Design a protein around this ligand. Structure first.
Ligand SMILES: C=C(Oc1cccc(C(=O)O)c1O)C(=O)O
Length: 436
């Protein structure tokens, strides 16, 4: 509801991130930038905030915090609070923790009090950036003036990045991998994704880092946020769930990994290896089966289908085997129920789910929080778009970190699994812009 023609030699990702940096800073506000199918949506300012925790639900608007106790499904509690936000505004944005998906698998009591499950907000203003134009939704005079100043200033040149060491293992990932391998060999579960955090020993400039890393990655979705004391950015390699206004539900499971970006002929050899490797084919097949079973739980009988099976999905520093699972949302179900059914992603949890999710509580640094959760965009028309939170950097308090994991199966070796985490961390490590 008002538009500005997109400038000549300006990329949408660069202008969207610059608007997020410069405009929100001049007004000192929180925001969330979400990239979805050629559109960069900047959700600027917080009109109301839904905070879902393990023990309480809070809705915060114009200084007033309303508290509620909730029981049963976290999805039903969040759904009720978000539908309310959406009666007022067209779109809501936020993040859903890994911990949101534990209730389905009987692990609710394992959550410590005040464990975040989700943060979803109604923005005061939305600025939508595409190749076509810049659209303004409910932008006030002060914001419009700040936008015009940004367009006249132009985009900042991105400085040289600063390197980070990913070779150290302070959290004993190699040790934790060996424990999971022993458990799988004993028949406890088939696969588990374990992870490790990597401390970034300097403050980074989130918008500039986002810009730099975006030039070198091909994610399904991307985000940049500053929300409630959390800064985060990511190049999501997978849609965990999308629910369209017409009832169509999609999930894009990934399983299997090879390095990418190492040179054309090297990348082709790795691509050919991935597509013919029995170990990778088996795991992908098993994951697509698990994913189909989950989507079946919320779909119209017999509406579930695999529309893309076992194809190479290129993701910057890595390439994965991917499938697309499509269904029709059953009338007895809803968008939150679909999210819960597909949560946490099989890709970043384990198989069987209940045993794999429980192994993560024992064998990984918990709560995972944003990592392996999702970044979400919800619409008043019933839409839900949820990007899997992998290939992301975070800043909370005075701490900046990266996080990456690997799929552990019976044949897994701690050394090769550690190397696999290095490949995934390389989606970001060469593009970290130091804060100036
Ligand atoms: C979990 C991470 O990445 C992954 C993505 C897709 C598949 C796998 C897998 O192991 O089959 C995988 O490990 C991470 O980037 O932290």
């Amino acid at each position: 509801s008002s538009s500005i023609p997109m400038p000549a030699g300006v990329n949408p990702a660069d202008l969207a991130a610059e608007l997020a940096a410069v405009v929100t800073e001049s007004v000192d506000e929180d925001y969330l930038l979400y990239e979805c199918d050629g559109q960069w949506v900047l959700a600027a300012g917080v009109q109301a905030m839904v905070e879902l925790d393990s023990d309480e639900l809070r809705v915060i608007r114009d200084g007033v915090t309303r508290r509620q106790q909730w029981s049963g499904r976290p999805g039903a509690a969040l759904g009720e609070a978000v539908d309310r936000l959406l009666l007022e505004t067209d779109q809501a944005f936020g993040w859903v923790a890994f911990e949101f998906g534990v209730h389905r698998y009987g692990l609710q009591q394992r959550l410590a009090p005040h464990t975040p499950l989700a943060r979803v907000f109604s923005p005061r203003t939305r600025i939508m950036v595409s190749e076509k134009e810049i659209r303004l939704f409910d932008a006030g005079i002060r914001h419009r003036e700040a936008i015009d100043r940004l367009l006249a200033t132009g985009v900042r040149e991105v400085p040289q990045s600063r390197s980070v060491d990913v070779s150290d293992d302070p959290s004993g990932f190699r040790r934790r991998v060996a424990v999971a391998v022993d458990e799988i060999a004993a028949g406890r579960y088939h696969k588990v994704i374990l992870s490790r955090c990597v401390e970034v020993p300097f403050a980074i400039d989130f918008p500039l880092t986002y810009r730099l890393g975006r030039r070198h990655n091909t994610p399904v979705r991307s985000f940049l946020l500053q929300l409630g004391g959390i800064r985060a950015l990511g190049y999501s390699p997978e849609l965990v769930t999308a629910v369209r206004a017409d009832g169509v539900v999609i999930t894009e499971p990934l399983a299997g990994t090879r390095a990418l970006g190492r040179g054309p002929a090297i990348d082709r050899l790795a691509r050919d290896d991935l597509e013919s490797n029995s170990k990778e084919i088996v795991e992908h097949a098993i994951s697509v089966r698990s994913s189909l079973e989950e989507i079946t739980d919320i779909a119209e009988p017999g509406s579930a289908a695999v529309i893309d099976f076992m194809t190479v999905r290129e993701r910057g520093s890595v390439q994965h085997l991917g499938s697309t699972i499509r269904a029709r949302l059953d009338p007895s179900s809803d968008r939150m129920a679909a999210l819960e059914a597909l949560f946490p992603a099989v890709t970043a949890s384990g198989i069987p789910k209940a045993a794999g999710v429980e192994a993560i509580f024992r064998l990984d640094e918990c709560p995972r929080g944003l990592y392996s959760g999702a970044v979400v965009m919800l619409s008043a028309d019933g839409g839900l778009d949820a990007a899997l939170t992998l290939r992301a950097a975070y800043q909370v308090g005075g701490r900046t970190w990266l996080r990456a994991g690997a799929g552990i199966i019976e044949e897994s070796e701690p050394e090769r699994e550690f190397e696999e985490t290095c490949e995934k961390l390389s989606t970001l490590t060469p593009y970290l812009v130091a804060r100036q």
